Write a protein that binds this ligand. Structure first.
Ligand SMILES: Nc1nc2c(ncn2[C@@H]2O[C@H](COP(=O)(O)OP(=O)(O)OP(=O)(O)O)[C@@H](O)[C@H]2O)c(=O)[nH]1
Ligand SMILES: [Mg+2]
Lengths: 172, 74, 49, 50, 267, 74, 340
């Protein structure tokens, strides 16, 4: 196809307030805002990227992290090539729930879906409670890539998606 | 069916009740015509001032209102 | 203790007052923020009307 | 029991020493601090009522 | 493509296991900090409302039927809260499914510290344990919390947990896959639901206690628990004859229990 | 309450042949409501024999309520 | 009468022991909240101690059910009052065990029980001061339930003892946790307003949760000695675990004053940490419960099924209505998904 080579469906999952929306906006629109508007249901934005000479259209999906808008069954993981599990590095409970989020991935996503643990809000160095080593050891035990991103100051947000897109491409 | 006072009412024939009612924003214009999705997912209301307003029939809430550049009746 | 008890009643009367001074102060501070908020709301609603 | 009772007497005696060694606070000096704050409270209550 | 459509269920009177209720998170704001009330009641500054943004609240779950409690209240284990109330705790209730009548409810009260040795109710919420057609509630439920009151277990409850109410259900149906997916349309529609939700957040000081009910699984099947009584299939062999026996007597061939009570007390 | 003992033997003549939990529970509610209106002679001699009966009932809710009723009646 | 009265006492006495040895804790729990103190009259002042109270004491051994341990403390005051002073010796160590519980809601219940037993004069005079010494550090506990439960005890103790004992015995214990020594601490408002800030929950949890908590306090105790001048200088931690933990604590805001409070709670935190560790060894077995799935293989119950594609009791009629709704929903979803 002349428009793109591959279309990867990326999903962003995590607790409410971790920055799943802000990471999506920082990647697709290159914008940040402090105005919190809890995601309900499902949202998606499309960014096409260059990677290893190939044209990859990324459809990144943003989901509700609030339990009020979540259910046991989850249709959103269906058809996703990669899932970003976002936790707030200043919020220990968000990191603890990554285990819960990985179980949802395991039972509802594809068997070979790609994964990525993202610790957002790394710019909040004074409030950080989850150390890079604690999360890196956790991610490495599971083999999932791990990055500490920041939607506020764009830190490492691009590379987190470039990593996912590259890993999915390595899978195809 | 749509009425002059902006209500787009869904009347169930095999009952006598309404399945739904959509109160169209008469600030937009008088409903002149409306179209329903073949998949029964969304509808669009065309008004006398050129506004065409979309409703999600699964959730029953309005989602878009694009108007004609000349505000020409639909 | 009779001598300390008398002085310690005052030490509580003073400290208790200080807590009411603090609370009543911030109550005014909050009472005055609703002034700027609702008076500004009054203005915008008068131009709007 | 004799040791416990003797220890109790030592304790009370020490505390008596502390109470007597410390100078009794001037009620007047604390009372003016209370009265100055009572004026502030009332002056403020008027402001709150307004 | 898809597993079959078979509906599996168990009778409630056949599931002899304790009911378990997950206490999830308490979303919403509390009743601010009315400093007018503190001047009137100085003990009120020494209360969870005024000491931390998230006081270490706890929930008590009690099951009621016909307005009476079926057993003692169960309390969530202590959890220190900092920025969100998320117990995430499964509570084993003292009632089993056979023990539950059709109008069993769970009265859930959120409690807070109010000075020494005194808990104040932050709110209460009551949800029936069986649905409209007698199926035990399944999965994740968000319950409306009634401020400053304990959950009411009376029949009918005055603190029922069940615009955003309708939309949330549709949103849950959408997330479960029961609603048809239309990407171009879901993207547009959920932004409006978000606007509605934010407006309701600002308009009202509502709180929701998300709870969850366990799923009964066997061999990767899902069983709903439907309310039944043992012998519920015993359609009585009623017959309309009165040829000889015009006047049926229910006590007809029955032990005289007033004579046996007497026998047991004299002899 | 002088004629109540005539109605009581209408109720108590049913109790040894009830089938459903709801009718055994309703039977228990009736006894509880009438109990304050009957003489102690009627309670101990007539109604207690039938509360100890439901205590041996097949339904645990019925057994549980029989004891609860018995306690309140006595 | 003497025979009939004793027979009735034995009948009830046997049923209470039967219920206090029930296989379900909720039965033992239920019996305690309803009338265990009222049933003490049947046992008598002596058998209530020998039988009833000994049975209740075993409830504290149940380390996997805090609700039963909490229910013991909610009802021990009635039995202890009835048994009398002969129960204070047996309950004193158990009440201290209740203050180092693995569940902080059992600590609050133990604190309350101590408060009530002090109000009733059940606590012996010297034991009142020993509990005051152990409960004082809770005045800086991050948990407000514990902190205010401690305030409940201390105010009651101050009311029970004379004003001389307040300044001469109880106040020395409270001076580290109070901003200003006020003799009116018998009032909850007075004590609550003079409390120092609690240890931060985060800092308290870091120390409490550390596996080497004993070696942490051993080191933190030496940092205090340098602060107090009892040492010329304090060497850095000798263990890499304590080094990592100490830098975690200092970076997360651990103040010099919080170190002092943490050292006051040292005894409580080491015992409490030990209790939590004991239960965790058993918690490895009970992990499937956290997952929201019930497995029927443990009972083999009659599972039932209907196909959603083709008197009368109220429950039977209602099942047919539910199955009808299920058939309609699946049909509706199928059609809806078919149009798209
Ligand atoms: N300091 C800092 N704050 C951030 C960052 N990202 C998000 N935030 C803040 O956290 C809030 C929540 O971010 P959202 O993106 O809305 O979080 P979310 O994951 O989408 O939450 P839900 O949509 O409810 O699932 C934002 O409003 C920001 O104020 C970040 O990278 N650094
Ligand atoms: Mg979002």
């Amino acid at each position: 196809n002349p428009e793109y080579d591959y279309l990867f469906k990326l999903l962003l999952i995590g607790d409410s307030g971790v920055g799943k929306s802000c990471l999506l906006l920082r990647f697709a629109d290159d914008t940040y805002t402090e105005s919190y508007i809890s995601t309900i249901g499902v949202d998606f934005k499309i960014r096409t990227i260059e990677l290893d000479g190939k044209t990859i259209k990324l459809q990144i999906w943003d989901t509700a992290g609030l339990e009020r808008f979540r259910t046991i069954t989850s249709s959103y993981y269906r058809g996703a090539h990669g899932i970003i599990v976002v936790y707030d590095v200043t919020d220990q409970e968000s990191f603890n729930n990554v285990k819960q989020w990985l179980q949802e991935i395991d039972r509802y996503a594809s068997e070979n879906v790609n994964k990525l643990l993202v610790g957002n809000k790394c710019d909040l160095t004074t409030k950080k409670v989850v150390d890079y080593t604690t999360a890196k050891e956790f991610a490495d035990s599971l083999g999932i890539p791990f990055l500490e991103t920041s939607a506020k100051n764009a830190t490492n947000v691009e590379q987190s998606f470039m990593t996912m897109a590259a890993e999915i491409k390595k899978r195809m | 069916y749509a009425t002059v006072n902006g209500s787009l009412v869904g009347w169930d024939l095999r009952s006598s009740s309404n399945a739904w009612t959509l109160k169209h924003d008469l600030k937009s214009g008088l409903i002149t015509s409306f179209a329903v999705d073949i998949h029964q997912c969304w509808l669009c209301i065309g008004t006398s001032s050129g506004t065409m307003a979309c409703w999600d029939m699964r959730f029953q809430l309005p989602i878009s209102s694009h108007c004609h550049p000349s505000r020409a009746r639909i | 203790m009779e001598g300390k008890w008398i002085t310690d009643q005052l030490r509580w009367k003073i400290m208790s007052c200080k807590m009411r001074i603090e609370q009543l102060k911030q109550t005014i501070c909050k009472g005055n923020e609703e002034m700027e908020k609702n008076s500004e709301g009054l203005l915008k609603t008068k131009e709007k009307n | 029991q004799l040791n416990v009772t003797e220890n109790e007497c030592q304790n009370y005696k020490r505390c008596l020493e502390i109470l007597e060694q410390m100078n009794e606070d001037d009620s007047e000096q604390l009372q003016m601090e209370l009265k100055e704050l009572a004026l502030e409270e009332e002056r403020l209550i008027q402001e709150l009522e307004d | 493509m898809g597993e079959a459509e078979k509906f599996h269920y168990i009778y409630s009177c056949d599931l002899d296991i304790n009911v378990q209720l997950k206490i999830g998170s308490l979303e919403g704001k509390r009743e601010q900090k009315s400093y007018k009330a503190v001047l009137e009641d100085p003990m009120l500054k020494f209360s969870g409302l005024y000491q931390e943004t998230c006081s270490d609240l706890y929930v008590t779950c009690q099951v009621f039927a016909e307005g009476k409690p079926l057993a003692l209240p169960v309390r969530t284990s202590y959890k220190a809260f900092s920025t969100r109330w998320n117990w995430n705790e499964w509570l084993k209730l003292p009632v089993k499914y056979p023990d539950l009548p059709r109008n069993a409810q769970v009265a859930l009260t959120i409690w807070d510290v109010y000075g020494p040795g005194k808990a104040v109710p932050v709110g209460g919420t009551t949800v029936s344990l069986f649905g409209k057609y007698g199926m035990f509630r399944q999965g994740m439920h968000d319950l409306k919390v009634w401020p400053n009151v304990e959950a009411d277990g009376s029949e009918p409850t005055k603190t029922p947990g069940r615009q955003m109410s309708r939309l949330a259900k549709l949103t849950k149906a959408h997330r479960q896959g029961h609603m048809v997916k239309v990407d171009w349309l879901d993207r547009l529609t959920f932004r409006e639901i978000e606007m509605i939700n934010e407006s309701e957040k600002r308009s009202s000081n509502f709180m929701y206690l998300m709870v969850e009910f366990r799923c009964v699984k066997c061999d990767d099947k899902e069983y709903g628990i439907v309310y039944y009584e043992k012998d519920g299939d015993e359609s009585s062999p009623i017959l309309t004859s009165f040829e000889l026996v015009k006047v049926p007597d229910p006590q007809m061939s029955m032990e005289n229990l007033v004579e046996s009570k007497h026998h047991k007390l004299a002899r | 309450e002088n004629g109540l003992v005539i109605l009581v033997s209408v109720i108590t003549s049913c109790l040894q042949t009830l089938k459903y939990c709801d009718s055994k529970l309703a039977a228990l509610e009736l006894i509880l409501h009438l109990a304050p209106r009957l003489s102690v002679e009627i309670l101990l001699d007539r109604i207690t024999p039938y509360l100890l009966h439901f205590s041996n009932d097949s339904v645990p809710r019925v057994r549980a309520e029989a004891l609860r009723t018995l306690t309140k009646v006595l | 009468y003497d025979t009939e009265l004793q027979a009735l006492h034995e009948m009830v006495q046997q049923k209470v022991v039967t219920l206090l040895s029930d296989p379900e804790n909720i039965v033992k729990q239920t019996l305690m909240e309803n009338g265990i103190t009222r049933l003490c009259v049947f046992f008598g002042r002596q058998k209530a101690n020998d039988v009833l109270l000994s049975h209740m004491i075993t409830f504290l051994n149940d380390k996997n059910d805090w609700h039963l341990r909490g229910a013991f403390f909610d009802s021990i005051v009635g039995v202890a009052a009835y048994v009398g002073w002969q129960s204070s010796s047996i309950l004193k160590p158990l009440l201290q065990q209740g203050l180092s519980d693995a569940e902080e809601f059992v600590i609050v219940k133990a604190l309350y029980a101590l408060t009530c037993m002090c109000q009733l004069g059940l606590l012996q005079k010297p034991h009142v001061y020993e509990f005051a010494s152990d409960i004082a550090p809770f005045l800086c506990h991050p948990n407000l339930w514990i902190r205010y439960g401690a305030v409940g005890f201390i105010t009651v103790v101050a009311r029970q003892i004379s004003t001389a004992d307040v300044y001469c015995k109880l106040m020395p214990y409270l001076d580290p946790y109070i901003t200003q020594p006020i003799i009116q601490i018998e009032r909850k408002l007075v004590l609550l307003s003079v409390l120092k800030e609690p240890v931060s929950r985060s800092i308290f949890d870091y120390a409490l949760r550390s596996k080497d908590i004993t070696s942490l306090f051993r080191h933190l105790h030496m940092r205090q000695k340098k602060r107090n001048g009892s040492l010329p200088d304090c060497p850095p931690p000798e263990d890499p675990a304590i080094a990592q933990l100490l830098k975690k604590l200092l970076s997360q805001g651990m103040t010099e004053e919080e170190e002092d409070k943490l050292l006051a709670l040292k005894d409580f935190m080491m015992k409490s940490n030990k209790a939590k560790a004991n239960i965790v060894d058993q918690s490895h077995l009970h992990d499937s419960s956290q997952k929201g799935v019930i497995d029927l293989a443990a009972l083999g119950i009659t599972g039932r099924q209907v196909d959603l594609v083709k008197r009368i009791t109220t429950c039977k009629t209602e099942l047919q209505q539910l199955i009808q709704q299920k058939r309609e929903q699946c049909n509706a979803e199928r059609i809806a998904k078919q149009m798209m």
